[PDB]
């Protein structure tokens, strides 16, 4: 998953079992995500 | 108004840590604040420098 960096705190408060597995990214200017989706 | 609710929450989660908690004197300090309120709900001030 990738989410705005300005929301990151809520992603680091959910119960741990829900969070296990998936990797996360965080960003503010879209030019970063464009360098993620197409490595 | 919202400041009212958050100060109320601080006092409340303090009292629970007195009625049974080891501490008999809560003293919030900026380092300690997380424990009672969790991580900040805001960090940016303006949406960015122009």
UniProtKB/Swiss-Prot annotation, chain A:
Protein family according to the UniProt entry: Belongs to the peptidase S16 family.
Oligomer and partners: Homohexamer. Organized in a ring with a central cavity. The ATP-binding and proteolytic domains (AP-domain) form a hexameric chamber, while the N-terminal domain is arranged as a trimer of dimers. DNA and RNA binding is stimulated by substrate and inhibited by ATP binding. Interacts with TWNK and mitochondrial DNA polymerase subunit POLG.
First and last residue of the signal peptide: none
Organism of derivation: Homo sapiens (Human)
Disorder: CODAS syndrome: A rare syndrome characterized by the combination of cerebral, ocular, dental, auricular, and skeletal features. These include developmental delay, craniofacial anomalies, cataracts, ptosis, median nasal groove, delayed tooth eruption, hearing loss, short stature, delayed epiphyseal ossification, metaphyseal hip dysplasia, and vertebral coronal clefts.
Domain notes: The Lon N-terminal domains are crucial for the overall structure of the protein, maintaining it in a conformation allowing its proper functioning. The AP-domain (ATP-binding and proteolytic domains) has a closed-ring conformation in the presence of AMP-PNP and its N-terminal entry gate appears closed. Upon ADP binding, it switches to a lock-washer conformation and its N-terminal gate opens.
Protein's UniProt name: Lon protease homolog, mitochondrial
Tissue-specific expression: Duodenum, heart, lung and liver, but not thymus.
Function: ATP-dependent serine protease that mediates the selective degradation of misfolded, unassembled or oxidatively damaged polypeptides as well as certain short-lived regulatory proteins in the mitochondrial matrix. Endogenous substrates include mitochondrial steroidogenic acute regulatory (StAR) protein, DELE1, helicase Twinkle (TWNK) and the large ribosomal subunit protein MRPL32/bL32m. MRPL32/bL32m is protected from degradation by LONP1 when it is bound to a nucleic acid (RNA), but TWNK is not. May also have a chaperone function in the assembly of inner membrane protein complexes.
Compartments reported by the entry: Mitochondrion matrix
Top-rank taxon, per record: Eukaryota
């Amino acid at each position: 998953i990738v989410l705005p960096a300005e929301n990151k705190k809520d992603f680091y408060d959910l119960a741990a079992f829900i969070t296990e597995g998936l990797e996360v990214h965080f960003v503010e200017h879209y030019r970063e995500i464009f360098d993620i989706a197409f490595p | 108004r919202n400041l009212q609710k958050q100060v109320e929450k601080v006092l409340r989660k303090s009292a629970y840590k007195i009625v049974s908690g080891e501490a008999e004197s809560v003293e919030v300090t900026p380092e300690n604040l997380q424990d009672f309120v969790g991580k900040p709900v805001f960090t940016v001030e303006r949406m960015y420098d122009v």
